[PDB]
Amino acid sequence: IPRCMEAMKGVRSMLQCMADTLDFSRLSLVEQHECLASILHAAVQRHHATIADFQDFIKILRKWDKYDHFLIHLIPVLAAYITEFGQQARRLNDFILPVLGAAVRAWWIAEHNDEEDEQRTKQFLDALKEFDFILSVAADCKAQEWQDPSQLGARQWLQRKIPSLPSEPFPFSHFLQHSLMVHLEGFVDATIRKLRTEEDEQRQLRPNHEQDMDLERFLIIISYAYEGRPDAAMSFWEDPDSNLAGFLQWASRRASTPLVSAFCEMLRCLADNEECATAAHNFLLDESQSLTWSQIFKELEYFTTKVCPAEIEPESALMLECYLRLIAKLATESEIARKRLIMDEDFNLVDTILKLSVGVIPHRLRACIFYVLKALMIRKTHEELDAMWRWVEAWMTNPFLGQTPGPQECMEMMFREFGTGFEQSNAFIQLLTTLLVPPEGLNSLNDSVPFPEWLGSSIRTLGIEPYVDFVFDVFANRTKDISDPSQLRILRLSCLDFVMVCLVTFNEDLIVLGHESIDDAMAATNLATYVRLHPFSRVMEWLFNEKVITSLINTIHQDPISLGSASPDSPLVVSILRAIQVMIKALELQETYLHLVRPEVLRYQGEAGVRRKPVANAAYSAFEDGILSHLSLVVDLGKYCNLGHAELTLACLKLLEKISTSSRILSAWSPRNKAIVQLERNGEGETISASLSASIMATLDPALAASGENYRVKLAILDFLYACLRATPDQPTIAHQLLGFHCELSKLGIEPKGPFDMQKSLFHSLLNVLITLTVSEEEQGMRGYLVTLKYRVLRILQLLWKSPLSASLVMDELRATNFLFHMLLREVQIQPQLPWDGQLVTGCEFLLSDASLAYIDYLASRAAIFEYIGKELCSVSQNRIPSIKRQIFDALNGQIFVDEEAPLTIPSIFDFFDFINTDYKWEEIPSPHFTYLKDLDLGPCIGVHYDIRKAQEILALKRKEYEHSQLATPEFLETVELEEKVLIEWLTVRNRANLLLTARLNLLQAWANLLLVMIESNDFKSTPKMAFLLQALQAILPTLEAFSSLKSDEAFELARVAKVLLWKLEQFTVGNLIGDKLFQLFQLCLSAISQCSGTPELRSLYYSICYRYLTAVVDTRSVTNARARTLKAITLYGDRLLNVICDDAYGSDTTCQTAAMILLNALVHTSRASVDCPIIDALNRLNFIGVLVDSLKEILNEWASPSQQYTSAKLALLLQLCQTRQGAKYVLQANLFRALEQSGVFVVALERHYALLVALARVVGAAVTARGAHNIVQGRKFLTQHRGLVVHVLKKNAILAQQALEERIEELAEAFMLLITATGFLEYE
Amino acid sequence: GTGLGEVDVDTYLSNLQTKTTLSMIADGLERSARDFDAFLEENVTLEWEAQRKRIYQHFGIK
């Protein structure tokens, strides 16, 4: 115990000598002293405190001199000492600033208590004459820094001779406040007829000299004590016969204006809960008379008539203020009290207080009346809403110079008087706000207009627009008159809260629906009625006014230190939050307003003829145009992110997202660049980058994962960066600066010795968190929030290194950090049994749980990773050959040699290829029944990607529409609810299915490209290369064979990786498994071609695959068996396959027909190698040879060009056909010679022309010599009809390009010579 | 992306695809020419290699 006294004395001596880094020291030491006092009274409450420590503590207090916080810290200690001790009791009684001593004496007398009683009363009244101290302590100890306007002046009208504590900001502990209020509760209970009689007779005899007003101070002590504690305040309502209930019955008998004020303050504090409020309400009903509602309302009427000199006494005005405050408290707390008071005519609360408001009264009394009205309308029904709106109408329209004042002039007078003073302004605006809160609830369908529609029809008052105009005129013009900053912040908070309550209830879904595709569908009378009457039409107009914008950015821009050091619930923060929220909502609903609302209003006002002052700035064609002028807004938001207020930070981040994304602002700022230089004015761009960095490396709470302040701030930062980077990507933006890059005019670099160049910036913080996060927790595999987070970070990086400006730097820094190796290290591979937040995949039925998104996100993450790898490998391979390729390839094989002793094991790239398991069958989902609402349209909703919000609104309004007609309402309704839920359930499932398929395709493209780059860019030798390609085939084949029936997008990627793999081609086992896989591929390619699957490009890949499998693999018992089974496979499908290949030839696609031509050539060649051919017979039956010979006509037009190589393959096929007997026959049968004669066909360009002539001459020669003497006459006619040409060539034949041309001439000469001798043109002579 | 030849991964592997297709075209042309050469080699080697060239060495102006 004494050691604690010594420590406290030392702390006080230190703080006193130090005043004669520093602020934080004073704060820490006073906190230590308060903790020590807390521990001291905790010990005294226990039986450890001895008899001498009591005397020592009372001696320290006797010596205490200054009224300081340190003294307040010891009040619980004294109370505990007196409670424990107060024979020992009698000795300590006798043993006992001066006001302290008096309070100590009074406390002991109350805790320990004919001659004795007389002495007690004597010395107790002596101490009292000298409560004021006890009250001053109770008030100062529990003093919130932000003032509550609803209770201004309450409990602050008693004379205080106590000196105000010094200005040092030492805030008491919440627990110390609770402890002191417990001790004051005990003091009240201990103390609980001479004082009342003495003081009231003293008032009447000499009222001019008010004195000894101690009983009121005692009641206020009770009020401060039981404040906030209804569980303890129940002692006044738990038992009627108790002494506390007796005290309440006694203090309320007589009505002395100051005592009545104190008693009503005491009730306001006691009645703090619904039960305590109901008990108080019942006490004042009385259903020796106590203070009842009857008396209160009687005096209200009496003073009402008094005001309308004739000005209420200060004490009476205070009395009325306490009455109205007690009314408001008991109305907000209790439903019974409010319902009884609002319309029990005997009380006539509303009418009487409205009359009193009209008359001349102080600002506070009028504000109290407004607050009473607000309390009466905090909860309401549409009937009470209409009633109160009728009474407000009569009170505003009607409560001399000429004959009479009009009604609109009356309303203007009411509005101009209000708003001049702060209290009237705040109370009236908050009442308006409360009135515009629908009784149903803020967030509901909200079909109706928040106020009665007829509020405008009478006396041409334009509905609610007057009230909105008043609130905005206060917010802009008449708030200039306010001086105290706290009042200004509270007023702006009230104004912006009014604006929000206005903008919320405006359902834009109803407006967009009605415009795209009325009377009863919505609760409102008509759509146009809802549009024009709703305050939204007017509110938006204001938000385009310059003064409103200036007042907003003035509300935002505040003192940063006073802002950060303030409380999150204080008006200083909440005001800025509401201002940001107003700006956000304006940017949101701006599109709806300018196009679907403003035209209707400007048309209805011209038709109806009515008009009102246009407040919107005609120059602002868009909300953005008003804020982009002064740039300082972005700086303020970024700085406020550093203040550690969750809600405010998120709001600032979303506002930055929208400010930077908008077309207007970006177009105006950057035609160097405004936003960047502005963030650089005083070096803010770096401190907010630092703050954001520390924010995205803050710890997380596993229990609170999705709803984690740090987690939500992270996602907000990432969403801001991604959204700012997506828009205007190829130019420097705010995000690029904040990441650490140096932004020159249309160029990005890194400033030496800065945060980025030293790996401290926001970008490196993203990398750090990305590489160190453990996505998969052990208990529940793959926690969704970490997956989503990784996706957000990876997509940011992806947009970063995709753009050309950032690409170079981002890729360099990622290589320097071994980013890839860490990612591959922490990337888990997918398995069917892997639970995602405790849910197996189990096919299509898994898409509905939010975990579905996680899966999708993870796929995207994978894709991003693979894309980087591909680029990395390629970018490493082309520029030079460093030793990094070795590391990349080892890591893709499951080995990292950064550590020399043991290379950690990673799933191989082929093991990572698990995302495609077609057993799920995502695509094919069932369609619901929809017996009811069979064809409910989904047009407004919208591959096909539905907008569920508009669908759900449709369902809600259709349920209301159906309800109104009244057809099987009580019973058949349950089935409608079920139908609705089934419908929205299926829509979400369909959306997520489509998104998953998109992610899967994108990931596959990435994976296929990765493997493709690997295949070409590698330094393998033959022995590892063969096994590497075997693994590739083992991975891709089961998919490409089983999935060929499903879809085509994936089949194209897998088919072309197979193509290239095959084309870039112990030892026996490998080569055999390879040939086995290659035959599997050949069979699946045949099966796909025979079914005319996919697009012509996928069929071109198939044809290329089949062509090489026939040219190289099959073309020695093993070879014979391979040829035999190959021909078996071809014959199995037979006519269909050949039919599709021939249809593909001479087709739309350029390369498909070429590949098909070359494939048919290889087919017939391998079938001959096995005297005729069945493939050639099939071709003859399918009329392929006929159309082919026909195409030989006009061949001059067709003939490096694609058409040239197509004709080359075409003529090569013709040649290979004319080689055999029946082939040449089928060719010749369809008027070949006539076709080539009609074509009129008879250094490198000459070489190509000679090659064409060679091909044609070879076709002719082969066809003639094949069948026999039936066509030798045709050969003789061909040589005689084109003679001279043959002579020219034979005479000619008898550097590189010249050698090629001469060889072609030699071949043409040989061809003509062969044709001549085989036909026997010598014999003809 | 500073050494000559550096191109986008897209261009790099698309040029790969085009390269493989062109090699297929050339391979098919080559083998066709050779397979044909083998056909007439079979037909001519059986008899009259020099007589077939001589007869027209004479018929037309040598």
Swiss-Prot record, chain A:
Keywords: mRNA transport, Nuclear pore complex, Nucleus, Protein transport, Translocation, Transport
Species of the source: Chaetomium thermophilum (strain DSM 1495 / CBS 144.50 / IMI 039719)
InterPro entries: Nup186/Nup192/Nup205 (IPR021827)
GO molecular function: structural constituent of nuclear pore
Source species, domain of life: Eukaryota
GO terms under biological process: mRNA transport; nuclear pore organization; protein transport
Similarity-based family: Belongs to the NUP186/NUP192/NUP205 family.
SUBUNIT field: Component of the nuclear pore complex (NPC). NPC constitutes the exclusive means of nucleocytoplasmic transport. NPCs allow the passive diffusion of ions and small molecules and the active, nuclear transport receptor-mediated bidirectional transport of macromolecules such as proteins, RNAs, ribonucleoparticles (RNPs), and ribosomal subunits across the nuclear envelope. Due to its 8-fold rotational symmetry, all subunits are present with 8 copies or multiples thereof. Part of a tetrameric NUP192-NUP170-NIC96-NUP53 module.
Described purpose of this protein according to its UniProt entry: Functions as a component of the nuclear pore complex (NPC). NPC components, collectively referred to as nucleoporins (NUPs), can play the role of both NPC structural components and of docking or interaction partners for transiently associated nuclear transport factors. NUP192 is located to the NPC core at the nuclear membrane and is essential for de novo assembly of NPCs.
GO cellular component, one term: nuclear pore inner ring
Pfam families reported for this sequence: Nup192
Protein known as: Nucleoporin NUP192
Localisation per UniProt entry: Nucleus, Nuclear pore complex
Disulfide bond positions: none
UniProtKB/Swiss-Prot annotation, chain B:
Localization (cell): Nucleus, Nuclear pore complex; Nucleus membrane
Biological function: Functions as a component of the nuclear pore complex (NPC). NPC components, collectively referred to as nucleoporins (NUPs), can play the role of both NPC structural components and of docking or interaction partners for transiently associated nuclear transport factors. NIC96, which is localized to the core of the NPC and the distal ring of the nuclear basket, is required for de novo assembly of NPCs.
Family that this chain belongs to: Belongs to the nucleoporin interacting component (NIC) family.
Organism, as annotated: Chaetomium thermophilum (strain DSM 1495 / CBS 144.50 / IMI 039719)
Complex formation: Component of the nuclear pore complex (NPC). NPC constitutes the exclusive means of nucleocytoplasmic transport. NPCs allow the passive diffusion of ions and small molecules and the active, nuclear transport receptor-mediated bidirectional transport of macromolecules such as proteins, RNAs, ribonucleoparticles (RNPs), and ribosomal subunits across the nuclear envelope. Due to its 8-fold rotational symmetry, all subunits are present with 8 copies or multiples thereof. Part of a tetrameric NUP192-NUP170-NIC96-NUP53 or NUP188-NUP170-NIC96-NUP53 module.
Upper taxonomic lineage: Eukaryota, Fungi, Dikarya, Ascomycota, Pezizomycotina
Residues of the full protein shown: 240 to 301 of 1112
Protein name: Nucleoporin NIC96
